[PDB]
Amino acid sequence: MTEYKLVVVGAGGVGKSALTIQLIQNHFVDEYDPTIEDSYRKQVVIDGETCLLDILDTAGQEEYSAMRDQYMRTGEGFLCVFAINNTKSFEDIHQYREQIKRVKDSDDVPMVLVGNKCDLAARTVESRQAQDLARSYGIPYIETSAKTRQGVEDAFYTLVREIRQH
Amino acid sequence: FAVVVRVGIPDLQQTKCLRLDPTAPVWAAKQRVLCKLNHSLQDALNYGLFQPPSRGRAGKFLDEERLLQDYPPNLDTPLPYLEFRYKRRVYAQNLIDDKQFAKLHTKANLKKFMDYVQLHSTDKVARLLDKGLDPNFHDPDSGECPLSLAAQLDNATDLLKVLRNGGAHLDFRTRDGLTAVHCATRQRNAGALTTLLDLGASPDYKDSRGLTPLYHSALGGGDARCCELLLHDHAQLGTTDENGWQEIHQACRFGHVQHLEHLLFYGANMGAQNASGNTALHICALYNQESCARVLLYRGANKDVRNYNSQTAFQVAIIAGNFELAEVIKTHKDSDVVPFRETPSYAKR
Ligand SMILES: Nc1nc2c(ncn2[C@@H]2O[C@H](COP(=O)(O)OP(=O)(O)NP(=O)(O)O)[C@@H](O)[C@H]2O)c(=O)[nH]1
């Protein structure tokens, strides 16, 4: 068995809480509940190995920006989440990536780029621009929709795979 | 105002960051934790905030009625840390075989234990507690816990003390949400109630509906000794139900004149109005409770108060057909009022 510490990092209202609920509880959260810091643990089988997931759902607001340093140190891998409809979230990803590198002080940290709200018809972020950003970072890009549970398992499992590499 | 606290729920394998208000009762913080856990836990009322065992200290459940500010936070963590745990028996400085503990808590053995409590076999109860039995459980059929059942027996002080020394939580609620203090009050078991209070049980414990033991006594009537005992131990007045009835409203509706007099002596707000704007005196007028209305007027209730229908108590009495009661209200003069000679004295503990 292994324990993987996964941290969901993202702007406010990007679907970090909704993604985490879908993986753990297999249910979609309709209403908007702001997060400070929420932790979940789940036993799953990935690629024929049973591994415990430590999932940390972090706060998108700068109000709890103080907690950012502590969670970046402890977490083995990060899920950087942006909303496909919201351009600001996409731009904010760079700040989070730099902070993770700065706190970790390593060029190579397991990371996965997630574009949420795939189901939303009005998409302001092209798949290709996100893919280009992912390529520069050297990490995978996954399009995930919490509402339809599309790619949710893939994004978290991909990150566990990234953790295995280092 | 409120502060960020990390609450760990080991049964759920979850942690949540809540803003909790240190200037409010622990009960209020517990409510906030229960809400944010949208997935209700089983027998949620028994779950309590928990101070995790630290260095040179033991684990302890937070007191529901004590203010949250009374428990200063552990500074070991960057954020204060509490846990939400079921109120299981605490075997502090105790280590026993998992199967042996499992053998002790079989359905049959728990039923045997409840039979000992019912038969008042104090020594046999104590021996089982000494061996590690957890008294914080429910009988499947009755819904009682050992402490709540003991609180309904005659001469219960020995059982109550033995159960508390053996780890019974004083606020462990029954399947219906009543604590031992509620049960003793409802049964008008004054001996059991006094011992529970002596053991440190709070007089303001809330049930599932948020009603206190004192509120139940006012609804129940009968021997008013338990009502007086609660009030003497600084039981809080002014509890409201969903419709805004306070203790005096209930006492008046049912004509529990002894309960009313105790409540009034200990400071009950006569001018409190419910959802309809009715004061206790309006309630007397609605239910033709002349014995109660006389006490209210005598002790200085304001007969001029209008409900939200713009009706006085007098006018309510007339509309309800209580003409004799209405004349008592009408006839009353301010000079008739006799304020209480003495203020209350309260129990030391
Ligand atoms: N269609 C759609 N709506 C979503 C999705 N994720 C969230 N929403 C909706 O938009 C809101 C944002 O989701 P939420 O999980 O609160 O965001 P977050 O990732 O938790 N950010 P934070 O917790 O810091 O506030 C929710 O109220 C929900 O109703 C998604 O993937 N698809």
Given a contact cutoff of 8 angstroms between Cβ atoms, the answer to whether A114 and A155 are in contact is yes
CA A75 to chain CA centroid, Å, is 12
DSSP SS3 for A20: helix
State the number of CA atoms in the 13 A half-sphere of A17 facing the CB: 17
Which residue type is seen at A89? S
Shortest Cα–Cα distance, B9 to chain A (Å)? 10
Shortest-distance Cα residue to atom 29 of ligand 1: A30
Containing structural domain, residue A29: 1-166
CB contact under 8 A, B79 and A67: yes
Q: Please choose, from the candidates B168, B170, B179, the residue with its C-alpha nearest in 3D space to the C-alpha of residue B135.
A: B168
What CA–CA distance (Å, rounded) separates B118 from B151?
A: 10
**B interface test, pick of A25, A26, A37, A71 with most B CB neighbours within 10 Å:** A37
CB–CB of B15 and A42 under 8 A?
A: no
Tokens of A153: 């398992």
Q: Inter-axis angle of helices B107-118 and B122-130, to 10 degrees?
A: 140
Angle at B230 between CA B226 and CA B233, to 5 degrees: 140
> What are the distances in angstroms from CA B238 to CA B175, B214, B231, B244?
26, 10, 12, 10
Token pair for B6: 């990390």
Interhelix angle B247-254/B213-220, nearest 10 degrees: 10
Distance CA B315, CA B330 (A): 10
Give chain B as a 3 state SS string. CCEEEEEEECCCCEEEEEEECCCCEHHHHHHHHHHHCCCCCCCHHHCEEEECCCCCCCCEECCCCCEHHHCCCCCCCCCCEEEEECCCCCCCCCCCCHHHHHHHCCHHHHHHHHHHHHCCCHHHHHHHHHCCCCCCCCCCCCCCCHHHHHCCCCCCHHHHHHHHHCCCCCCCECCCCCEHHHHHHHCCCHHHHHHHHHCCCCCCCCCCCCCCHHHHHHHHCCCCHHHHHHHHCCCCCCCCCCCCCCHHHHHHHHCCHHHHHHHHHCCCCCCCCCCCCCCHHHHHHHHCCHHHHHHHHHCCCCCCCCCCCCCCHHHHHHHHCCHHHHHHHHHCCHHHCCCCCCCCCCCCC
As given in the structure block, the two tokens for residue B282 are 């309006």
Residues of chain B with a CB closer than 8 angstroms to some CB in chain A: 4, 6, 13-19, 39, 78-79
Burial grade of B102 (CB within 10 A; 0-12, 13-18, 19 or more): exposed
Q: Which residues contact B239 (CB under 8 A, 6 or more apart)?
A: B210, B211, B212, B214, B215, B246, B247
Rounded to 5 degrees, φ, ψ at B130 are -60, -35
Q: Into how many domains does chain A fold?
A: 1
Q: What span, in angstroms and rounded, lies between the C-alpha atoms of A153 and A160?
A: 11
Closest Cα partner for B240 from B217, B273, B285? Answer: B273
- Phi and psi for B160 in degrees, rounded to 5? -65, -45
Sequence letter at residue A165: Q
Out of B17, B19, B79, whose CB is closest to A38? B17
Picking from B17, B85, B33, B15, the residue whose alpha carbon sits closest to that of residue B3 is B17
Chain A residues touching B77 at Cβ < 8 A: none
In contact, B272 and B280? CB cutoff 8 Å: yes
How many angstroms is the resolution?
3.3
Q: Reduce the secondary structure of A2-13 to three states and give it as a string.
A: CEEEEEEEECCC
Q: How far is B11 from chain A (nearest CA, A)?
A: 11
Give residue limits of the domains in chain B: 1-88, 89-349
Atom of ligand 1 nearest to the CA of A18: 15
| Phi and psi angles of residue B271, each rounded to the nearest 5 degrees, phi first | -85, -5
- Way the structure was solved: X-ray
Rounded to a whole number, what is the distance in Å from the CA of B77 to chain A's nearest CA? 11
Separation of CA B77 and ligand 1 centre (Å): 29
Ligand 1 geometric centre to CA of B14 (Å) = 19
* Helix, strand or coil, per DSSP, at residue A123: coil
> Is A60 a known ligand-binding residue?
yes
Report the CATH number at residue A137: 3.40.50.300
Residue whose entry in the numeric block shows the structure tokens 């709890």:
A64
A119 lines ligand 1 (CB under 6 A): yes
A58 in a known ligand binding site: yes
Please state the atom number of ligand 1 nearest to the C-alpha of residue A8. Answer: 19
Ligand 1 pocket member A144 (CB < 6 A): no
Q: Which residues contact B98 (CB under 8 A, 6 or more apart)?
A: none
Determine if ligand 1 sits within 6 Å of the CB of residue A14.
Answer: yes
Chosen for mutation from B16, B81, B83 (greatest number of chain A CBs closer than 10 Å) is B16
d(C-alpha A19, C-alpha A115), whole Å: 11
Q: How far is it, in rounded angstroms, from Cα B156 to Cα B125?
A: 13
Q: Do B16 and A42 touch (CB under 8 A)?
A: no
CB contacts of B15 in chain A (<8 Å) are 37-39
Asked if A36 reaches chain B (Cβ–Cβ under 8 Å), the answer is: yes
Listed residue (B140, B141, B145, B88) closest to B118, CA to CA:
B145
Sheet of A141-143, strand order:
A141-143, A111-116, A77-83, A3-10, A49-58, A37-46, B14-20, B3-9, B81-85, B48-51, B60-61
- Write the single-letter amino acid at B4: V
DSSP state, A65?
G
- Neighboring chain B residues of A67 at a CB cutoff of 8 Å: 78-79
The rounded Cα B274 to chain-centroid distance in angstroms is 21
- Give contacts of A 37-56 with B, CB under 8 A: 37-42
Q: Cα(A102) to centroid of ligand 1, in Å?
A: 28
Do residues B135 and B167 touch, judged by C-beta distance below 8 A?
yes
